[PDB]
Design a protein around this nucleic acid. Structure first.
Ligand SMILES: [Zn+2]
Ligand SMILES: [Zn+2]
Ligand SMILES: [Zn+2]
Ligand SMILES: [Zn+2]
Lengths: 201, 198, 201, 198
DNA sequence: CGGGCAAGCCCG
DNA sequence: CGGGCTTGCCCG
DNA sequence: GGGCAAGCCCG
DNA sequence: CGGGCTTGCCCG
């Protein structure tokens, strides 16, 4: 029943950590992350891997949820859905399991379930927590974002925050991480432009 | 027929004219006589002037229909893009279908036509004589998508075709002009006119 | 009937002219008229004397209609009424003879009629023709304008035209004259400001 | 019936803060900590942050009520100007009373009170505890008239009184700040702060 | 009667 | 985002 | 009205 | 891959 989802980082018991590994320096690169600005820059409907870590294994049945919220207060109350244009296109909605309205999708996990809170009307996607893989330090979830930030009728130029939540079976919060998201035509350019705007302060 | 263009004044000489407009960069609308092109903002009231040599038949009307200019695209029926069609911004008002690009404001006797087989869409109003002492009959048009709209007109130029016609359907007058729906009509006109000079 | 009343001057077969007498130059004169800009500057709810003259007198039961219309196309279709504040206002609707909604009222005539066409919702005011008071060139009608142009919720800040129509006993327009209206606190100030501000274009 | 705007952080250390905000001339809102004063654009989303250390009481709710600052006018109820109340521009589409100055934006549990005897207007929401990991409960307010509006607050300032209450209407906590609803909060703030040194 | 200001708003 | 043009209204 | 934003065109 | 331009929109 939580309208206006919290976005403050909260490592919780197990020290919940969200990080970004690959970095492909380019203007029109499928994606990249600005640590300085705590902002992910990503191409529409492209695969992008995010890295999740814990020190101590979370209780059984724990899940990981991703949910978008608007950064600005005026808009915060507005639910982040896909724009009409992209929603109704056959592109990407042709025989998917994911609803057409959802902005965030998970790539490569069939256990992934798409939540439409019946009261708060909020949209999100959850997957069960998996402990890395024996050689590894990270549980890698791979996400898809299905609309550009600029998309008219949808996000319409308005910034969003992506909130990753480590949760119990019932939904209790164990860990939280948030970061700004921008779905772009060209991540590198838009990143550099914003990073320079920060340098020029 | 789908869809005639060539201008034809006729028995009553049908003239479509535009009054003097703002030169402003974001003026709700403007007309370039040089380029025979109307530049107008999305959803803004855009007045057009109709003139005839002789008082026409009683059961006669004026219809406006959009069609793509370029040879490739004429086939395609021009409607509103999905975003604007479904978005709440102007469709909340009862009067016109949300699909139609061209809308008529201020007239209640606005008939929105969807040809049942050649799915062309257009808007018609009964012709009225100018009010006493007046040269022009003014119709108020609204254009409900930007020319640039993706999944709609998608940056493709279109002509607006104003036809004077009988209840029968006989087309006694035809006039047309290029249309562009944009954010900054003044700017885009100026820019075009400069580039016609090249 | 008409939903766009035309503004176009139409001198009648009976030579219809709408005139203004000498107009006090003071900053906040009850009213003043710019012949240069063909616009009256009237104080809200003040006696504003209009001069009307004709070459040949018209048939009996011929009357004069005054109706406000927004000047610009973007607003043309909006009917010109009094703002909510002033309409429901107690401050000027005691001594009530007129509908509180009507912008334009007439002072001194009790044949003064208020038309509220229910077809096109168009508000106007009508009085029967009086051949100029004896020895006079013209007929003096007193108009009152009941809202400031700037009035919010009403005609807020949007210019208007006033259309005086020389009408036959049953409808037919015999002559028409229009002029811009601005209902302000300081007509003199606003007049000068306009006229001066025009003298470079 | 004057509401007690006298402040007391009672049992739980009841306090209201304002997050950091833009220093723009016409920024939707801004707060001068220096002056006990919130500068707000009309009908814009204005977030208030509430913090408590020990929350318990179950039926507890939070109400916001406007009152005039200067004592002469304190007796006068703070309603919306007739213009804005009767107007179309912000009323149809919501389920909040047209007369009330203060509205709550992101909440359906919000209830808009009309004091049967006092005729005072207020808006109450149930106390929601901060979400896990989170410092404060963040209530979204909007203010529906400019301070300057004639027929309402005739340029005369007001205070906003946020009260933490038991479902009986028992003041657990109270905090208050002066409000100014204007077109240009940044400008008015900057100017106001300056016109405080002497 | 005119000068001046507050506070909304528009245009560059 | 300012800077600067409104305008109703108060002051003297 | 100028300048900036941002999807996508072009070589 | 990046420089650049068009067209919407907001502001060193
Ligand atoms: Zn989209
Ligand atoms: Zn569109
Ligand atoms: Zn008024
Ligand atoms: Zn108000």
């Amino acid at each position: 029943h939580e309208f206006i989802p919290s976005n403050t980082d909260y490592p919780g018991p197990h020290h919940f950590e969200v990080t970004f590994q690959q970095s492909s320096t380019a203007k029109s690169a499928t994606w990249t992350y600005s640590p300085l600005l705590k902002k992910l820059y990503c191409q529409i409907a492209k695969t992008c891997p995010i890295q999740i870590k814990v020190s101590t294994p979370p209780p059984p049945g724990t899940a990981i949820r991703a949910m978008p919220v608007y950064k600005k207060a005026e808009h915060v109350t507005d639910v982040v859905k896909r724009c009409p244009n992209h929603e109704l296109g056959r592109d990407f909605n042709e025989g998917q399991s994911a609803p057409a309205s959802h902005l965030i999708r998970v790539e490569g996990n069939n256990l992934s379930q798409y939540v439409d809170d019946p009261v708060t009307g909020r949209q999100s996607v959850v997957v069960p927590y998996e402990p890395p893989q024996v050689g590894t330090e990270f549980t890698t979830i791979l996400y898809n974002f299905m609309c550009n930030s600029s998309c008219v009728g949808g996000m319409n130029r308005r910034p969003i925050l992506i909130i990753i939540t480590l949760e119990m079976r019932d939904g209790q919060v164990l860990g939280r991480r948030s970061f700004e998201g921008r779905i772009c035509a060209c991540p590198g350019r838009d990143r550099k432009a914003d990073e320079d705007h920060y340098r020029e302060q």
